[PDB]
Amino acid sequence: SGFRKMAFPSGKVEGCMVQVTCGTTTLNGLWLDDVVYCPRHVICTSEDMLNPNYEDLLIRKSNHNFLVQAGNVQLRVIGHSMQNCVLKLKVDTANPKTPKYKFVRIQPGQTFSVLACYNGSPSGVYQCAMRPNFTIKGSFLNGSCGSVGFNIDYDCVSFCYMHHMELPTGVHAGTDLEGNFYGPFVDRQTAQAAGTDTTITVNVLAWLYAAVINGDRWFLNRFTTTLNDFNLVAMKYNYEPLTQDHVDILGPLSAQTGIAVLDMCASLKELLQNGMNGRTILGSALLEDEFTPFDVVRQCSGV
Amino acid sequence: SGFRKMAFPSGKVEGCMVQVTCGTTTLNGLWLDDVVYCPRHVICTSEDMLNPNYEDLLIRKSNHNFLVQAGNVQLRVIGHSMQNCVLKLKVDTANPKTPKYKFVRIQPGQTFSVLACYNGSPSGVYQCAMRPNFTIKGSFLNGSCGSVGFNIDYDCVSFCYMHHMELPTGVHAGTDLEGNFYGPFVDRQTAQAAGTDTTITVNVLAWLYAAVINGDRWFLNRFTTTLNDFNLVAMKYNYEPLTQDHVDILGPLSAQTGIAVLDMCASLKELLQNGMNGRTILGSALLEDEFTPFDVVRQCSGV
Ligand SMILES: *C(=O)[C@H](C[C@@H]1CCCNC1=O)NC(=O)[C@H](CCCC)NC(=O)/C=C/c1ccccc1
Ligand SMILES: *C(=O)[C@H](C[C@@H]1CCCNC1=O)NC(=O)[C@H](CCCC)NC(=O)/C=C/c1ccccc1
């Protein structure tokens, strides 16, 4: 029993983190086979983040402008190229610790683990969700750029996020490992801000199932609801619409608890309309939306 | 910016996890140098957990009764002994991945990372606090016994917890790595239950400082309070007394924010008396007490 925000074990990713310096800027890189991946803004000076032509800065750079350090072993850069908003630095040594891996782009509402790093050295690990507005609510200080987000299945690491910047609201923006930003964000200095966010409805329902599996039952009721009348209430409270696919995805949790999805939807509607009146669910006084149905099943396996 | 429940990178500990089987019971062991540490209840049968004489079961066991598997390599047990509630299984191979390590016992109110494991294979990592009543609120299923809790400083792993059991309330109990239980709990079948818990006051104040560092300021006020009048209110709300040492420990966070500790205490008193009236702090509608002052400083380094 018990339910926690749980990250994947970070060992396989720790072995891939290196330090990348260009000019006076140091950040983190990801060392897989003979390539080091890092944010391309490492080549920017502060005189040129208003409107950097990243191409421009890059043609003016050479291999020796990039210092790559793996622990206390310098790697020699033998090639450099740009892939969207990421740099690929070819090095003369393949990483002996390279795990089986994939580069995957995730969907809003999906979760992943972040290995926060500074100067190529891991500092901590935590779980994030990709928000509907393509930001993440992380914990990132200056120097954390190039830290990565990932999931593990079996022992293949699926990398899904590389960290690039913080927005004025204190949330974070980054790319997939092909260097394509999540959301309408750019690696140049603008007044860019997060657009309007919403609550991940299917995840809230997953977490209510987690609560029932762990013996929190006070919010349950007889009532059921129609999907249509549920989505009418969800819309009013800035919740994403619930689709039939979401209902299907919640199937296994519904079977294990014996609580039909639309039965649980009636509980959520009443929580949205009444609040909790001083009670908590799984230690929370708010409805939690950063656990996917998979997260719940994986952690709550057989109670 | 940002503040998350962050665990230590788990890589150094992942390399120490093995699988231990005795009879039909399988659980996890910790492999350091040529010793494997595991809960002694691995030698119990279900016919004998009412009143096991653990000594008895152990004299009746031989080295070959213990099957130790490290990945897919069986380790040969060449000696076995009991150390309080932990078994020490001497094996014929020293773990080549043994980190620098220490066995440390922690205090109620201190935090640590848990590497949840099943069949010697790590599943996830999360942060726990030792509750004032010496339980932990973890996430543990059958088979998780022998998973360990730890902190890292520099690159020395300080192991502080080994998991043994779940209480009827769904919280968890375990030992230090010398096999001495935290709290009044025993590795035998009783109606044992967690005693009365309290809120870790110094940690709540640390987390309020975290919030201020991250731009959450709405709960602040002019008021200051005396330590005596604060502790009168804390007592009423089941909060631990705040000592002058706690005040001193909060010194650096007070300096960085420019908010005196007793100034922040006045904010906490009003939160305790009024609630938040619909607002949140660092994404929480409850006052969070599982971040130590160190946790905050380490994560909030320079904003
Ligand atoms: C990379 O290490 C660094 C991390 C940031 C910076 C400190 C705050 N938290 C983080 O994650 N990334 C940058 O410094 C980045 C480079 C921009 C590309 C030219 N810029 C930002 O993060 C912008 C912060 C900001 C916030 C509000 C208004 C303007 C700028
Ligand atoms: C070890 O792997 C296992 C883990 C437990 C069991 C399932 C629930 N969550 C856990 O962490 N530990 C045990 O099974 C343990 C062995 C007891 C020593 C003889 N016993 C318990 O955890 C007791 C659970 C319980 C709860 C309420 C009433 C009675 C028993």
XYZ file of C-alpha atoms and ligand atoms in Angstrom:
666
model
C 0.000 0.000 0.000
C 0.844 3.659 -0.277
C 0.968 6.014 -3.237
C 3.840 8.368 -3.962
C 5.094 10.534 -6.779
C 7.667 7.983 -7.919
C 10.431 8.491 -10.473
C 12.207 5.855 -12.512
C 15.583 4.676 -11.190
C 18.085 7.130 -12.645
C 21.191 4.955 -12.900
C 21.078 4.346 -16.650
C 20.759 8.071 -17.326
C 23.405 9.175 -14.789
C 25.951 7.277 -16.875
C 25.131 9.444 -19.899
C 25.501 12.922 -18.362
C 28.519 15.057 -19.305
C 29.483 18.727 -19.096
C 29.540 20.988 -22.167
C 31.245 24.378 -22.272
C 31.354 26.890 -25.114
C 32.676 30.364 -24.427
C 31.818 31.173 -20.821
C 28.592 29.116 -20.887
C 28.554 25.686 -19.234
C 25.585 23.305 -19.278
C 24.830 19.589 -19.454
C 25.042 17.174 -22.342
C 23.695 13.691 -23.019
C 26.359 11.226 -24.198
C 25.000 8.307 -26.217
C 27.303 6.213 -28.429
C 29.747 8.765 -29.954
C 27.378 11.787 -29.868
C 26.809 14.417 -27.165
C 23.442 16.202 -27.324
C 22.946 19.621 -25.742
C 20.834 22.792 -26.126
C 22.067 24.871 -29.019
C 21.836 28.074 -26.977
C 25.184 27.049 -25.464
C 26.742 28.891 -28.444
C 24.966 32.156 -27.697
C 26.551 35.149 -26.065
C 24.476 37.580 -24.060
C 25.030 40.199 -26.772
C 23.003 38.038 -29.166
C 19.992 36.349 -27.561
C 17.552 39.043 -28.733
C 17.529 37.668 -32.298
C 20.222 35.000 -32.654
C 20.620 33.479 -36.063
C 21.714 30.154 -34.584
C 22.913 29.058 -37.932
C 25.183 32.115 -37.923
C 26.788 31.448 -34.539
C 27.277 27.821 -35.583
C 29.140 28.376 -38.893
C 31.447 30.659 -36.876
C 32.214 27.831 -34.411
C 34.830 25.065 -34.692
C 35.147 21.691 -32.968
C 37.736 23.087 -30.563
C 35.247 25.718 -29.361
C 33.364 22.922 -27.529
C 34.843 21.516 -24.321
C 33.187 18.221 -23.330
C 34.104 16.659 -19.980
C 32.895 13.239 -18.821
C 33.698 13.100 -15.141
C 37.353 14.069 -15.226
C 38.031 12.842 -18.767
C 37.879 15.354 -21.600
C 36.231 14.030 -24.760
C 37.530 15.301 -28.092
C 34.873 16.851 -30.337
C 35.479 15.692 -33.919
C 32.290 17.021 -35.509
C 29.363 19.322 -34.771
C 25.966 19.829 -36.327
C 22.636 21.390 -35.509
C 19.424 19.394 -35.267
C 16.643 21.904 -34.735
C 17.215 23.393 -31.253
C 19.782 20.761 -30.156
C 23.467 20.463 -31.022
C 25.025 17.102 -31.886
C 28.724 17.029 -30.963
C 30.445 13.980 -32.408
C 33.167 12.808 -30.016
C 36.039 10.387 -30.500
C 34.814 7.941 -27.823
C 31.581 5.979 -27.674
C 30.045 6.033 -24.211
C 30.707 2.570 -22.700
C 27.693 3.118 -20.419
C 25.213 3.765 -23.265
C 21.934 2.016 -22.384
C 19.461 0.687 -24.868
C 17.524 3.848 -25.696
C 14.945 5.547 -27.910
C 14.042 9.174 -28.610
C 10.282 9.542 -28.111
C 8.097 12.634 -28.110
C 5.408 12.565 -25.444
C 1.845 13.955 -25.370
C 0.439 16.535 -22.974
C -0.866 14.583 -20.015
C 1.982 12.030 -20.085
C 4.495 11.813 -17.236
C 8.268 11.318 -17.128
C 11.221 11.420 -14.761
C 13.676 14.347 -14.763
C 17.317 13.893 -13.732
C 18.274 17.402 -12.669
C 21.986 17.998 -13.342
C 24.592 20.732 -12.924
C 28.086 20.706 -14.467
C 27.419 17.217 -15.805
C 26.740 15.871 -12.293
C 23.273 14.599 -11.277
C 21.658 16.384 -8.320
C 18.223 14.782 -7.939
C 15.382 12.949 -9.656
C 11.684 13.760 -9.750
C 8.501 13.102 -11.691
C 6.933 15.699 -14.065
C 3.911 15.792 -16.355
C 3.779 17.500 -19.719
C 1.069 20.123 -19.093
C -1.741 20.647 -21.637
C -0.073 23.977 -22.445
C 3.265 22.156 -23.137
C 5.084 23.539 -20.092
C 6.379 21.454 -17.232
C 6.374 22.377 -13.569
C 9.935 21.412 -12.706
C 12.769 22.425 -10.402
C 15.582 23.946 -12.459
C 18.294 26.484 -11.570
C 20.805 28.222 -13.792
C 23.135 25.579 -15.188
C 20.448 22.902 -15.406
C 19.966 23.233 -19.167
C 20.621 19.971 -20.935
C 19.131 17.898 -18.107
C 16.811 15.305 -19.624
C 13.444 13.695 -18.975
C 12.801 10.031 -19.659
C 10.755 6.914 -19.034
C 12.043 3.356 -18.741
C 10.332 0.275 -20.112
C 12.146 -2.992 -19.469
C 15.657 -1.598 -19.680
C 15.275 0.673 -22.688
C 15.447 4.375 -21.766
C 12.951 6.428 -23.800
C 14.293 9.992 -23.655
C 11.536 12.541 -24.139
C 12.693 15.926 -22.855
C 15.764 18.156 -22.810
C 15.632 21.277 -20.645
C 16.150 24.716 -22.247
C 14.541 27.526 -20.259
C 12.267 28.950 -17.603
C 9.231 31.110 -18.348
C 8.237 34.205 -16.327
C 5.630 32.231 -14.358
C 8.354 29.909 -13.078
C 7.393 26.914 -15.242
C 9.770 25.300 -17.712
C 10.068 24.699 -21.443
C 12.233 22.364 -23.471
C 12.512 20.135 -26.507
C 12.298 16.513 -27.431
C 15.670 14.905 -28.171
C 15.286 15.727 -31.852
C 15.454 19.351 -30.699
C 11.828 20.250 -31.456
C 10.255 22.414 -28.762
C 7.237 21.307 -26.820
C 4.760 24.140 -27.276
C 5.049 27.576 -28.859
C 8.349 28.448 -27.206
C 11.634 29.553 -28.790
C 15.265 29.631 -27.637
C 15.566 33.395 -27.964
C 14.760 36.265 -25.627
C 11.102 37.245 -25.907
C 8.224 38.031 -23.570
C 6.987 34.485 -24.243
C 4.618 33.160 -21.600
C 2.681 29.976 -20.949
C -0.755 29.884 -22.563
C -3.850 28.868 -20.620
C -3.507 25.517 -18.847
C -6.214 22.961 -18.030
C -6.539 19.990 -15.682
C -5.800 16.495 -17.027
C -9.149 14.800 -16.388
C -8.208 11.196 -17.163
C -5.285 11.490 -14.749
C -7.473 12.815 -11.933
C -9.751 9.800 -12.385
C -6.725 7.488 -12.402
C -5.600 9.006 -9.101
C -9.082 8.555 -7.599
C -8.780 4.881 -8.519
C -5.356 4.871 -6.835
C -7.037 6.287 -3.724
C -9.721 3.592 -3.689
C -7.058 0.882 -4.164
C -5.303 2.352 -1.110
C -8.437 2.495 1.061
C -9.519 6.122 0.568
C -13.226 5.759 -0.223
C -15.082 8.731 1.301
C -15.688 10.505 -2.032
C -17.518 7.545 -3.589
C -21.285 7.583 -4.192
C -24.105 5.577 -5.815
C -24.586 8.090 -8.472
C -23.516 7.530 -12.011
C -23.476 10.116 -14.761
C -23.483 10.275 -18.522
C -20.255 11.101 -20.308
C -22.061 14.101 -21.809
C -23.251 15.524 -18.499
C -19.829 14.920 -16.983
C -18.055 16.817 -19.766
C -20.482 19.712 -19.299
C -19.299 20.028 -15.696
C -15.630 19.448 -16.581
C -15.734 22.288 -19.125
C -17.045 24.642 -16.433
C -14.074 23.892 -14.147
C -11.306 24.111 -16.779
C -10.971 20.304 -17.077
C -10.106 18.610 -20.341
C -12.927 16.683 -22.017
C -13.089 12.992 -21.219
C -13.170 10.822 -24.331
C -14.377 7.275 -24.804
C -10.734 6.290 -25.282
C -9.992 7.713 -21.811
C -12.864 5.596 -20.475
C -11.409 2.525 -22.194
C -7.928 3.282 -20.866
C -9.357 3.370 -17.325
C -10.885 -0.078 -17.937
C -8.369 -2.132 -15.942
C -8.531 0.185 -12.920
C -12.334 0.066 -13.093
C -12.270 -3.740 -13.166
C -9.850 -4.016 -10.245
C -11.909 -1.695 -8.044
C -15.339 -2.713 -9.319
C -16.189 0.970 -9.811
C -17.420 1.868 -13.294
C -15.667 4.817 -14.924
C -18.885 6.831 -15.161
C -19.542 5.967 -11.506
C -16.187 7.534 -10.603
C -17.047 10.474 -12.877
C -20.056 11.181 -10.653
C -17.696 11.333 -7.662
C -15.453 13.785 -9.511
C -18.384 16.011 -10.472
C -19.399 16.288 -6.813
C -15.817 16.984 -5.723
C -15.675 19.720 -8.361
C -18.978 21.212 -7.197
C -18.582 20.845 -3.415
C -14.877 20.650 -2.710
C -13.689 18.214 -0.070
C -14.949 20.140 3.012
C -11.747 19.619 4.949
C -10.960 16.033 3.960
C -7.991 14.747 1.983
C -7.369 12.108 -0.680
C -4.044 10.232 -0.645
C -2.623 13.022 1.500
C -3.781 15.821 -0.830
C -6.328 18.593 -0.337
C -6.375 19.179 -4.107
C -7.309 16.910 -6.991
C -4.041 15.542 -8.417
C -3.594 15.257 -12.184
C 0.072 14.251 -12.723
C -0.466 10.482 -12.421
C -1.387 8.646 -15.624
C -3.444 5.431 -15.589
C -0.172 3.585 -16.296
C 1.551 5.288 -13.354
C -1.246 4.033 -11.089
C -1.302 0.472 -12.411
C 2.494 0.205 -12.275
C 2.675 1.422 -8.662
C -0.582 -0.078 -7.283
C 0.001 -3.584 -8.711
C -2.307 -5.834 -6.681
C -3.313 -3.278 -4.027
C 12.883 28.212 -9.874
C 10.418 25.525 -8.937
C 10.189 23.233 -5.934
C 9.620 19.499 -6.147
C 9.814 16.465 -3.922
C 13.228 15.427 -5.224
C 15.054 12.168 -4.542
C 18.767 11.513 -4.741
C 20.037 9.908 -7.958
C 19.665 6.178 -7.372
C 22.475 4.806 -9.530
C 24.924 4.014 -6.733
C 22.260 2.079 -4.840
C 20.859 0.229 -7.885
C 24.257 -1.437 -8.223
C 23.916 -2.908 -4.725
C 20.476 -4.546 -5.010
C 20.241 -8.349 -5.202
C 17.546 -10.981 -4.706
C 17.429 -13.206 -1.610
C 15.352 -16.373 -1.353
C 14.931 -18.698 1.617
C 12.245 -21.355 1.486
C 9.414 -19.953 -0.616
C 10.063 -16.351 0.501
C 11.862 -13.977 -1.870
C 12.833 -10.399 -1.011
C 15.612 -7.895 -1.661
C 19.121 -7.710 -0.290
C 21.800 -5.027 -0.157
C 25.196 -6.194 -1.449
C 28.146 -4.229 -0.080
C 31.691 -5.639 -0.252
C 31.261 -9.399 0.452
C 28.104 -9.108 2.620
C 24.415 -9.187 1.653
C 22.051 -7.535 4.150
C 18.364 -8.447 4.274
C 15.421 -8.588 6.719
C 15.717 -11.584 8.988
C 12.037 -12.443 8.541
C 13.075 -14.047 5.240
C 13.705 -17.201 7.327
C 10.188 -17.292 8.739
C 7.456 -19.598 7.574
C 3.829 -18.611 7.895
C 3.393 -21.301 10.559
C 5.740 -19.332 12.823
C 5.273 -15.559 12.636
C 3.024 -15.442 15.721
C 6.004 -15.839 18.080
C 9.128 -16.658 16.063
C 12.270 -17.258 18.029
C 14.432 -15.885 15.221
C 17.456 -17.320 16.847
C 15.755 -20.718 16.606
C 14.969 -20.543 12.888
C 18.530 -19.342 12.281
C 20.442 -22.161 14.050
C 18.286 -24.535 11.971
C 19.430 -22.851 8.728
C 22.567 -23.534 6.662
C 24.395 -21.446 4.063
C 22.817 -23.448 1.246
C 19.333 -22.498 2.481
C 19.965 -18.953 1.158
C 19.814 -18.343 -2.591
C 21.359 -14.981 -3.536
C 21.080 -13.801 -7.147
C 22.772 -10.671 -8.503
C 21.163 -10.050 -11.855
C 21.583 -13.461 -13.432
C 24.652 -14.479 -11.419
C 24.146 -16.597 -8.317
C 26.363 -15.614 -5.390
C 27.550 -18.375 -3.072
C 26.706 -17.827 0.602
C 29.721 -18.838 2.707
C 28.535 -17.544 6.082
C 25.422 -16.226 7.807
C 24.799 -14.323 11.002
C 22.099 -12.270 12.643
C 22.540 -8.612 13.532
C 19.419 -7.585 15.407
C 16.564 -7.706 12.855
C 18.844 -7.979 9.782
C 20.688 -10.995 8.393
C 24.274 -10.717 7.158
C 24.989 -13.290 4.435
C 28.693 -13.492 3.669
C 29.181 -14.245 -0.033
C 32.235 -15.375 -1.966
C 32.345 -12.261 -4.188
C 32.802 -8.635 -3.205
C 30.430 -6.347 -5.074
C 32.549 -4.550 -7.719
C 29.962 -1.741 -7.715
C 30.204 -1.047 -3.957
C 30.087 2.737 -3.453
C 31.691 4.588 -0.615
C 29.047 4.172 2.081
C 28.094 4.590 5.736
C 25.338 3.157 7.929
C 23.612 6.077 9.667
C 20.503 6.157 11.825
C 18.296 9.161 11.156
C 16.056 11.249 13.448
C 12.311 11.757 13.154
C 11.856 14.764 10.913
C 14.785 13.854 8.626
C 14.214 12.907 4.986
C 15.718 10.239 2.725
C 15.291 8.623 -0.672
C 13.755 5.145 -1.045
C 14.693 2.854 -3.944
C 11.665 0.587 -4.162
C 12.711 -2.861 -5.430
C 11.150 -6.221 -6.273
C 13.081 -9.447 -6.944
C 16.331 -7.507 -6.658
C 15.300 -5.135 -9.473
C 14.678 -1.412 -8.822
C 11.192 -0.140 -9.698
C 11.179 3.529 -8.673
C 12.653 6.181 -6.399
C 10.917 8.627 -4.088
C 11.482 10.855 -1.079
C 10.223 9.952 2.448
C 10.435 11.544 5.884
C 10.851 9.665 9.132
C 7.612 10.608 10.933
C 7.687 11.724 14.592
C 6.021 8.392 15.399
C 8.860 6.511 13.571
C 6.710 5.325 10.662
C 7.222 6.328 7.064
C 4.537 7.017 4.499
C 5.941 5.006 1.611
C 4.794 2.982 -1.381
C 5.573 -0.693 -0.790
C 3.948 -3.881 -2.122
C 4.551 -7.485 -1.170
C 8.098 -8.365 -2.171
C 9.483 -4.908 -1.421
C 11.083 -5.910 1.883
C 14.796 -5.265 1.870
C 14.449 -2.091 -0.209
C 16.576 0.617 1.387
C 16.447 4.322 2.164
C 19.493 6.547 1.868
C 20.971 10.004 1.474
C 24.011 10.967 -0.584
C 26.632 13.503 0.415
C 29.420 14.012 -2.104
C 29.529 10.448 -3.370
C 29.235 8.582 -0.085
C 25.886 6.785 0.288
C 24.585 7.008 3.871
C 22.124 4.114 4.182
C 19.522 4.777 6.851
C 16.536 2.488 6.314
C 15.714 -1.090 5.352
C 12.063 -1.943 4.729
C 10.378 -4.683 6.807
C 6.607 -4.268 7.013
C 3.361 -2.383 6.609
C 1.118 -1.379 9.507
C -2.703 -1.587 9.450
C -3.016 2.136 8.672
C -1.028 1.635 5.470
C 2.183 3.280 6.716
C 5.511 1.475 6.859
C 8.071 0.363 9.425
C 11.664 -0.753 9.105
C 15.125 -0.766 10.615
C 18.398 1.023 10.291
C 21.106 -1.014 8.551
C 22.309 -2.327 11.899
C 18.896 -4.007 12.068
C 17.468 -1.875 14.888
C 13.837 -0.921 14.315
C 12.731 2.659 14.055
C 9.979 2.961 16.645
C 8.215 0.408 18.830
C 7.672 -2.116 16.052
C 8.672 -5.790 15.888
C 9.123 -8.315 13.070
C 6.434 -10.647 14.371
C 2.679 -10.783 13.894
C 0.921 -8.517 16.383
C -1.841 -5.923 16.346
C 0.920 -3.290 16.398
C -0.189 0.119 15.173
C 1.363 3.535 14.679
C 1.230 5.765 17.749
C 0.027 9.358 17.559
C 1.819 11.429 14.915
C 2.549 15.171 14.905
C 3.526 17.750 12.290
C 7.222 18.587 11.826
C 7.171 22.320 12.575
C 10.710 23.239 11.522
C 10.096 21.560 8.166
C 6.870 23.481 7.559
C 8.772 26.721 8.164
C 11.539 25.561 5.818
C 8.931 24.932 3.123
C 7.400 28.388 3.665
C 10.873 29.799 3.045
C 11.045 27.654 -0.105
C 7.746 29.222 -1.185
C 9.010 32.768 -0.642
C 12.222 31.957 -2.562
C 9.979 30.779 -5.417
C 7.731 33.862 -5.394
C 4.809 32.636 -3.267
C 4.364 35.487 -0.783
C 0.637 35.862 -0.029
C 0.837 34.331 3.469
C 3.426 36.836 4.716
C 2.547 39.582 7.214
C 4.115 42.340 9.348
C 3.411 40.536 12.488
C 6.076 38.858 14.504
C 5.527 36.577 17.461
C 7.411 35.293 20.457
C 8.720 31.747 20.393
C 6.604 31.098 23.493
C 3.346 32.341 21.997
C 4.074 30.458 18.789
C 4.623 27.169 20.624
C 1.343 27.694 22.484
C -0.463 27.752 19.136
C 1.606 24.892 17.680
C 0.703 22.656 20.635
C -2.994 23.304 19.986
C -2.703 22.098 16.369
C -0.606 18.964 17.018
C 2.648 20.619 15.851
C 5.993 19.790 17.398
C 7.526 22.489 19.599
C 9.950 24.824 17.880
C 13.293 25.038 19.661
C 15.959 27.711 19.539
C 18.121 25.217 17.649
C 15.378 24.993 14.995
C 15.433 28.798 14.807
C 19.218 28.729 14.389
C 18.996 26.019 11.732
C 16.589 28.230 9.755
C 19.150 31.058 9.946
C 20.479 30.807 6.382
C 16.993 30.677 4.848
C 15.997 33.673 6.979
C 19.046 35.613 5.782
C 18.453 34.793 2.116
C 14.812 35.888 2.239
C 15.228 38.714 4.744
C 12.333 37.276 6.764
C 13.106 36.651 10.433
C 12.206 33.192 11.716
C 9.749 34.579 14.267
C 8.270 36.724 11.483
C 7.599 33.548 9.486
C 6.237 31.939 12.666
C 3.557 34.643 12.763
C 2.572 33.666 9.210
C 2.332 30.015 10.243
C 0.184 30.832 13.275
C -2.305 32.655 11.045
C -2.321 29.822 8.501
C -3.017 27.418 11.364
C -5.838 29.597 12.698
C -7.448 30.692 9.412
C -6.520 28.109 6.817
C -5.648 29.310 3.337
C -9.201 30.270 2.218
C -8.832 28.650 -1.176
C -5.241 29.612 -1.973
C -2.250 27.325 -2.426
C 1.441 27.380 -1.523
C 3.931 25.770 -3.929
C 1.033 23.865 -5.471
C -0.280 22.548 -2.134
C -3.515 23.241 -0.269
C -1.974 21.759 2.892
C 1.061 22.770 4.919
C 3.914 20.468 3.849
C 6.291 19.060 6.464
C 8.510 16.539 4.603
C 11.143 19.052 3.446
C 14.012 19.721 5.854
C 15.880 23.049 5.897
C 18.725 21.228 4.108
C 16.350 19.917 1.432
C 15.256 23.504 0.755
C 18.743 25.008 0.678
C 20.061 22.211 -1.544
C 17.229 22.582 -4.076
C 16.658 26.377 -3.894
C 20.357 27.316 -4.212
C 20.322 30.970 -5.287
C 16.582 31.259 -6.005
C 20.146 26.836 -18.616
O 20.881 26.309 -17.810
C 19.271 27.996 -18.166
C 18.299 27.512 -17.060
C 17.176 28.576 -16.678
C 17.789 29.761 -16.186
C 17.568 30.118 -14.788
C 16.182 29.904 -14.297
N 15.683 28.481 -14.466
C 16.180 27.772 -15.721
O 15.846 26.647 -15.994
N 18.504 28.479 -19.313
C 18.544 29.891 -19.665
O 19.195 30.666 -19.026
C 17.719 30.351 -20.886
C 18.608 30.672 -22.083
C 17.765 31.426 -23.142
C 18.214 31.181 -24.574
C 18.888 32.408 -25.199
N 16.872 31.490 -20.641
C 15.825 31.433 -19.644
O 15.661 30.450 -19.005
C 14.904 32.653 -19.465
C 14.520 32.960 -18.213
C 13.553 34.204 -18.300
C 12.400 34.257 -17.500
C 11.539 35.360 -17.597
C 11.818 36.405 -18.508
C 12.955 36.345 -19.314
C 13.823 35.241 -19.219
C 8.014 -7.781 2.510
O 8.225 -7.821 1.319
C 6.590 -7.563 2.999
C 6.077 -6.188 2.498
C 4.687 -5.746 3.141
C 3.683 -6.697 2.808
C 2.587 -6.265 1.948
C 2.061 -4.905 2.237
N 3.115 -3.814 2.179
C 4.498 -4.231 2.668
O 5.423 -3.461 2.699
N 6.585 -7.582 4.460
C 5.676 -8.474 5.166
O 4.928 -9.191 4.567
C 5.711 -8.460 6.710
C 6.375 -9.713 7.273
C 6.087 -9.788 8.794
C 7.184 -10.470 9.595
C 6.764 -11.849 10.117
N 4.421 -8.319 7.336
C 3.608 -7.146 7.098
O 3.987 -6.292 6.371
C 2.267 -7.010 7.841
C 1.237 -6.470 7.166
C 0.005 -6.396 8.150
C -0.823 -5.262 8.158
C -1.905 -5.200 9.048
C -2.152 -6.264 9.946
C -1.321 -7.385 9.949
C -0.234 -7.451 9.057
